[PDB]
Subunit: 158 residues, 6 copies
């Protein structure tokens, strides 16, 4: 079978990410949401809290587990025994940066293939960075993230 690994910051996890997991859960027999620590980017939520948010959003999917890791992505995919990388591609991404990451990871872990999916047309154009800025200014983010994610973001700025 195929065990897909979905790595990302997930700070926070949005409906664009969630729609990708919904499509990935129907496709693969096992989906691993690999929440990366990434302490150099200064995430708003901690690695511990980001894992709990991704679990609440994906608690309805049986073959989906969320794990936090602070090691190299190329080494962690071997430790998780996953053979497929998963990244999202919408009309608002990093087409340049996404190819360098997929190509350089193919040199570190040639057994792991990097495939890309596209979210729904309604949940594209939704970035986690703009979600935090709107949440920091008291904006309504019910359209971009799960209701549980909106609770953490609302509580984070009080």
């Amino acid at each position: 079978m195929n065990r897909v690994l979905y790595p990302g910051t997930f700070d926070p996890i949005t409906k664009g990410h969630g729609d990708l997991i919904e499509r990935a859960s129907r496709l693969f027999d096992h989906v691993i949401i690999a929440v990366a620590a990434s302490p150099k980017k200064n995430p708003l939520f901690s690695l511990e809290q980001r894992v709990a948010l991704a679990q609440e959003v994906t608690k309805h999917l049986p073959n989906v587990e969320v794990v936090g890791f602070s090691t190299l992505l190329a080494h962690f995919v071997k430790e998780q025994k996953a053979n497929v990388f998963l990244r999202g591609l919408r009309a608002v991404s990093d087409f340049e940066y996404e190819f360098q990451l997929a190509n350089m990871n193919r040199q570190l872990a040639p057994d792991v293939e990097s495939m890309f999916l596209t979210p729904s047309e309604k949940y594209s154009f939704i970035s986690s960075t703009l979600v935090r800025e709107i949440a920091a200014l008291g904006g309504d983010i019910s359209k971009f993230v799960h209701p549980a994610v909106a609770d953490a973001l609302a509580e984070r700025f009080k």
Copy 2:
């Protein structure tokens, strides 16, 4: 009537912004230059001086108003009773970020329309970030910005 709101950092305001304001004043009955504080990017000039610079550059246009705001753009455009967003289109810039911002602003303020303009070929490829870097190294920036902006930047790095 049409009351357009042109939001941005304007740190500093350049001839690309000025040409965009010149075209916006000819089209709409009232142009509001909404200078955002944006403390997370560490602006070179303060919000007060960026408003004063945009007023000096646009003092010859009667239907142009400059205001500084530090709140959410979706809330501030409603308080100004503006129904049109204005954003600039050059080379490629962040074609992704411009689409995600316009779409996410359409979810917070669906009544406010996001339109885009393109400056003249003479004032394209002029970014506010590169103006500060050349000014920090003592370079001649009289060609890229208004004479008043060149004075403030010269006073900033001497």
Copy 3:
């Protein structure tokens, strides 16, 4: 006043065009849909039927007029006394062609301003070319175009 001219082939007119006309009617006092003949690309529908389709789709909007023209766009916009060009912005499309066309039109008609709009996320990624190809193979195109356009395309390939 503001009299916007929306030029294009409209072969056929899609929901992406329709959403753009809906937003243009709310903003400007008069919208002119300038349907171009464009015989070099070999359009599927004639200029007469493309005008009739755009009139049927926009018959509910009072400030919208549909006209067919086979002359230069720069000459026709002057004859219609329009001062604003209107073009659509989706995914990426021909970001190059849109800039060269807007700039070269600014050399032929500098008094006519070229502004760009973006349709809703629901009607983006909808091209007139792919609508004809799916219609030619008997596909269901009720989701992409107006019901009247689906009738003409169905009559075209049966």
Copy 4:
């Protein structure tokens, strides 16, 4: 089950396609190379000959089948009972057409998921159109296509 369908013109099939089929064969239990007729593009090789070329290039893979079709891709994928669309992304593809095709196919066949793969850096930047132009001028195309394709192209233009 996972039965992937790889549609394309394959006129002719190149080493960029071949590396994509080899990576798709490692992931899925069955790979279907769906060679489209596309008579409107005026293909260099016929639909029958394009299928025979793709069979020779992929004759070493047991779980790979090549079929030719001249109907709608959404109807043919339903007839093949395939649940995965496959398209290639080499950072020099048609991100515009690829996103419009995947999204509009999601309206015709929502049960079929559109995923994208990336070939190796050595086999990227290889387009079937430029292979025909170099072959038409007597150029050496042994590096871009399979040896069997090089024989057909050499026989085609000599």
Copy 5:
């Protein structure tokens, strides 16, 4: 010394192309304007007439010669004993197609390096295709091409 080869259709040659030749003539000791026949694209002007136009535009440059060729570009650069390919890069080009051409030509002629230049900001966004369409509709093309090129285009449509 360096003998640069500037290949292209030049149908017709524009001021964007001319500005590239002006910069190339100051840089290299010898500039060869290689006008390609390209009969499959159906050029407006013949290969014989396109050579005469490029000679009239560049008659003021001593180290610039215009030649017409109907063979492979990779073979013709060896026959011309040129070691540098030259292509233009503006904010309106074919960033995808330009890399495939430069990379695949590096496999056919590894001794010939493909370098890229950028024209002036005023002469960017000027394509030969839009020049012919505007000329075919009686438009004023004095801004895009040399006065001699405007004479041929005006005489061509009478």
Copy 6:
């Protein structure tokens, strides 16, 4: 004369840069690798150490000199009496920043021409930022950078 100036951060220098310097050495009589200080980017290696790394990678080329500078690029190129700017384009670069930098540098130093080269397909998609992130996590970066750079990065994060 032709004295090319190759500016960049080189933090660290990669194989994509190295292939670009080897191709630049074949063309010009003298290649100057201008390592910029750039203290605002917080480089991993110091300006002195980045110059020493570029010297070891290019020690086999006689006509290549590496110098460090902390002034404006337009002022330093005048002090070096160089007439050619050199930047790399691998279809995954920063076409936005690269065009804005080349055009605005043409206002500061019009006598200095900005040309672009493309590295091999094997050494494209290699960014200095991703090399540091993989090295910081103990990853194998022997394939992306020179062996001397691999020793420094291994000593830097071990």
